[PDB]
Amino acid sequence: IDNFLKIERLAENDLPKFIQLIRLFEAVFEMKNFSIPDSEHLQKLLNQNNFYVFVALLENKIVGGLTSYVLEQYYSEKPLAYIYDLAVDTNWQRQGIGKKLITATNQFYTEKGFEEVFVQADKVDDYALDFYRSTKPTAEEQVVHFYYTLK
Amino acid sequence: EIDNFLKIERLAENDLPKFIQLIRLFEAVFEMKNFSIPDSEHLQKLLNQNNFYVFVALLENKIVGGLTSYVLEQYYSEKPLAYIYDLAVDTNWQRQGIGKKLITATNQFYTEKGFEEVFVQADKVDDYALDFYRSTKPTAEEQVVHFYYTLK
Ligand SMILES: OC[C@H]1O[C@H](O[C@H]2O[C@H](CO)[C@@H](O)[C@H](O)[C@H]2O)[C@H](O)[C@@H](O)[C@@H]1O
Ligand SMILES: [Ca+2]
Ligand SMILES: [Ca+2]
Ligand SMILES: [Ca+2]
Ligand SMILES: [Ca+2]
Ligand SMILES: [Ca+2]
Ligand SMILES: [Ca+2]
Ligand SMILES: [Ca+2]
Ligand SMILES: [Ca+2]
Ligand SMILES: [Cl-]
Ligand SMILES: [Cl-]
């Protein structure tokens, strides 16, 4: 596939590819009764200087991607990147696409002089864990994630 | 009994000195090795960002606790998320409600701003932090794994 596959970092004139990726997230994550935000909101997000999206393309079809947030640090002038979502179309999994997305993401942030990139996976998702373990991370740590649903 | 002396405040752009005090508190409580604080130009730039909010606890004008939080605009909703990144309380003033009041003020702030959710993480080996967050009425907790790629 590495003759056909293209990895692309989205820019501000890439809203259609971004929407395609959000729809892939909806599909792969099996999100229920999802209503996509209006395009104006999604464009503002894409225009943020702390947000970077990477996609995998076959021809003009988005077949995978990931989203990431920049966290400027107070411990270092070298920022963190937080990978928020990563998905590959079920029809194109096990073809190296996820690994290529992680590699491209980390290379980009390396060139930008970042300290570290990190990502979260659920402890019961053994295949996600297998995947991230195969990308040669520096460290892996058990974490408890808490949230507060606001009124 | 500091209940009537404790002040909880959200840092403004003129609060670099309190921000630096908080960062030193983090260095002490988290026992950080070989820490060189970034220069103040960088720290001021961060404090100036409109997607970064710091809450502190004060006894008089001494910082005795605080937390840092990042706004994450979503593509799943127009309502943002807030990510609490660090929270610490002076070892001399722990287990006296300071952490709880910081979390309450933080969630109240983001509620008023119409955010969807505030989230925070603790290392599984950090028994103290886990018992703390479980005492703040979180909506839920999830067992997860973090993977880190430290860059050259
Ligand atoms: O495909 C596996 C799961 O991916 C997502 O969940 C991960 O990413 C979330 C957003 O950063 C985290 O909150 C979560 O802890 C991770 O597991 C997706 O939301 C899940 O539905 C998928 O099953
Ligand atoms: Ca493009
Ligand atoms: Ca799933
Ligand atoms: Ca921009
Ligand atoms: Ca510098
Ligand atoms: Ca030393
Ligand atoms: Ca500002
Ligand atoms: Ca979730
Ligand atoms: Ca280096
Ligand atoms: Cl894959
Ligand atoms: Cl406390």
Q: How is residue A92 annotated by DSSP? A: G
Phi-psi group of A58: left, alpha or beta (phi > 0 → left; psi -120 to 50 → alpha; rest → beta):
beta
Q: How many angstroms separate the alpha carbon of residue B39 from the centre of ligand 5?
A: 7
Is-contact A10 A42, C-beta < 8 A? Answer: no
Residue A45: both structure tokens together = 């997000």
Q: Which one-letter amino acid corresponds to residue A73?
A: Q
Residue B39: both structure tokens together = 């220069």
Number of H helices, E strands in chain A: 4, 6
Is-contact B63 B22, C-beta < 8 A? Answer: yes
Mutate to test the interface with A, among B20, B26, B71, B75 (most CBs of A within 10 A): B75
Domain count, chain A: 1
Closest atom of ligand 1 relative to the A128 alpha carbon = 2
Q: How far is A78 from chain B (nearest CA, A)?
A: 9
Question: Exposure pattern of B53-89 as b/e (b: 16+ CB <10 Å)?
Answer: bbbbbbbeeebbbbbbbbbbbbbbbbebbbbbbbbbb
Find the residues whose C-beta lies inside 6 A of ligand 1: A 29, 84-85, 120-122, 125, 128, 145; B 142, 144
Q: Which one-letter amino acid corresponds to residue B38?
A: P
Contact yes or no for A142 and B143 at CB 8 A: yes
Q: Taking the CA of residue B6 as centre, how many other CA atoms within 13 Å lie in the half-sphere pointing to its CB?
A: 21
Q: How far is A1 from chain B (nearest CA, A)?
A: 26
Measured in degrees and rounded to the nearest 5, phi and psi for residue B93 equal -125, 20
- Resolution for the entry shown, Å: 1.5
Q: Which residues of chain A does B49 touch, with a Cβ-Cβ cutoff of 8 Å?
A: 72
Q: How was this structure determined?
A: X-ray
CA distance A85 to A88: 10
Q: How many angstroms separate the alpha carbon of residue B125 from the centre of ligand 4?
A: 39
Q: Which residues of chain B does A150 touch, with a Cβ-Cβ cutoff of 8 Å?
A: 107, 110-111, 115-118
Contact yes or no for A69 and B74 at CB 8 A: no
Q: Tokens 């990510």 belong to which residue?
A: B83
Task: End-to-end CA distance of chain B: give it in Å, rounded.
Answer: 49
Q: Tokens 């989203």 belong to which residue?
A: A67
CA distance A78 to A140: 21
Which helix (DSSP H) or strand (DSSP E) does residue A27 occupy? helix A15-28
CATH number of the domain that residue B149 is part of:
3.40.630.30
Q: How many angstroms separate the alpha carbon of residue B97 from the centre of ligand 7?
A: 29
Range of the domain at A100: 1-151
Q: Which residues of chain A does B35 touch, with a Cβ-Cβ cutoff of 8 Å?
A: 75
Contact yes or no for B139 and A147 at CB 8 A: yes
Q: Given the DSSP bridges, would you call strands B81-89 and B117-123 parallel, antiparallel or unpaired? A: parallel
Of B19, B85, B121, the CB nearest to A145: B121
Q: What is the 3 state secondary structure string of chain B?
A: CCCCCEEEEECCCCCHHHHHHHHHHHHHHCCCCCCCCCCHHHHHHHHHCCCEEEEEEEECCEEEEEEEEEEECCCCCCCCEEEEEEEEECHHHCCCCHHHHHHHHHHHHHHHCCCCEEEEEEECCCHHHHHHHCCCCCCEEEEEEEEEEECC
Pocket test of ligand 1: the residue of A53, A97, A124, A125 to mutate, having most ligand atoms within 8 Å of its CB, is A125
Q: Which residues of chain A does B120 touch, with a Cβ-Cβ cutoff of 8 Å?
A: 145-147
CA distance B122 to B33: 19
